[PDB]
A paper describes a structure:
Rev1 is a translesion DNA synthesis (TLS) polymerase involved in the bypass of adducted-guanine bases and abasic sites during DNA replication. During damage bypass, Rev1 utilizes a protein-template mechanism of DNA synthesis, where the templating DNA base is evicted from the Rev1 active site and replaced by an arginine side chain that preferentially binds incoming dCTP. Notably, Rev1 is the only DNA polymerase known to use an amino-acid side chain to encode for an incoming nucleotide, instead of a templating DNA base. Additionally, Rev1 does not undergo large conformational changes upon incoming nucleotide binding.
Residue numbers in the entry: 306 to 744
Amino acid sequence: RIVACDDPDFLTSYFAHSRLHHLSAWKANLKDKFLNENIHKYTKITDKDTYIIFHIDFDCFFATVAYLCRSSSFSACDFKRDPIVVCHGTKNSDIASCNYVARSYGIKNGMWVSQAEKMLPNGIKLISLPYTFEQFQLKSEAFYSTLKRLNIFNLILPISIDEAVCVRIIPDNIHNTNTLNARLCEEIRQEIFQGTNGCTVSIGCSDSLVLARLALKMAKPNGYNITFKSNLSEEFWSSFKLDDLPGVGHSTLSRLESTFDSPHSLNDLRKRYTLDALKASVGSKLGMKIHLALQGQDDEESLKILYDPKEVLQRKSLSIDINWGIRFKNITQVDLFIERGCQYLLEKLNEINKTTSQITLKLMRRCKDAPIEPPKYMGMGRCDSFSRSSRLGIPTNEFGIIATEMKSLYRTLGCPPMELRGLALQFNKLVDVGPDNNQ
DNA sequence: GGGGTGTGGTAG
DNA sequence: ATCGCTACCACACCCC
Ligand SMILES: Cc1cn([C@H]2C[C@H](O)[C@@H](COP(=O)(O)OP(=O)(O)OP(=O)(O)O)O2)c(=O)[nH]c1=O
Ligand SMILES: [Ca+2]
Ligand SMILES: [Ca+2]
Ligand SMILES: [Ca+2]
């Protein structure tokens, strides 16, 4: 039942098991579905519209669904009392999702099982459930079907398998109130709970995208929060960590902590920062984004999804990344893998009826001082990254052209096959295919 | 002013 | 064991 990377079935088996592959494939499908359902519609927010954002997201999605769908081997498992994770393995295996019991011990999505087990007091046992990928998708379908059926939103924007941004336009003749917004939140939560046979969503409700995201975090688990710009307070900002802000990850977090004397909440940050010191710390565009976010306001870039969702959701690149299980003995096997990847990508490219004029090969190579077999079974371990791109000239979907150039790109980066630990193949620029192809 | 490249980072 | 994907914005540093 084990498929090595030189086996023709490797890509199929890896993608079938990989949560992150599913995460990307689901999002791509939701994007395509939105564009197809709106090819002739012109559903979009205009400058004349005043809107409310309902940002809706499943609580511990994989853990909830895997629990509801668990096999009889786990019948006695208790979602409200047991710490529950979803993962493949037993040690250096990622926790895809953990329930809020597990989180009360400090366990987080993305931790290794080995790390999470150590956070449990003696006598407390971690419950590890398998993935149920098809049921994740079915629950998502129920989610999106329910959102449409409620007929309360002018625009429903897919964010992910378990998350959507739902926009309600308020006519100027209508007096919106907290009570009406609360009743809509409760309707949404109950209808999704029924429609999904027991999954919970939380909801952030506001007059900006960024505040609706923060409200969502405040609402979790299994709740809703309504915080409009009018309602902003010190109590609100004091409730969030710095990387609760959209666009702030670990690297930006570290830079903000170094620049502003280790702020411990968004309130700390907003009382200490200056716009200029903030652009200097994290960059001009991200600095302006954060500055606006601390006023509860969206930046120009984030607003594009409301005003032109078709262009924001339109796919502009196509790629695969395989950075697990990569163990090749020679260049012949590397070349065959590149060919299989190009075949896979060209199927995707032909499905969307496009050609490509620029491609990229990226690789991960074992660091010179890193063990040949890393801590994580079949992991890439510590690696150096290399990337090179090539303009094709004539846009094409021809395997011969693209695969030959990808294999040449690999040659130019000089990685010995045995040192290779990861490969990415990218079609960076896509070109339409029209009815007129006479030259 | 226009173009290019590889790399960093974040989102889900 | 264990499945560490993928799209896209932003940036620094080059060309004219
Ligand atoms: C962010 C992320 C999510 N996922 C999957 C598992 C998650 O259950 C699902 C949705 O992601 P999230 O919404 O980020 O997480 P969650 O729903 O488990 O927990 P929360 O209550 O805090 O929202 O997507 C991954 O597999 N890898 C990831 O990096
Ligand atoms: Ca979620
Ligand atoms: Ca989500
Ligand atoms: Ca963030």
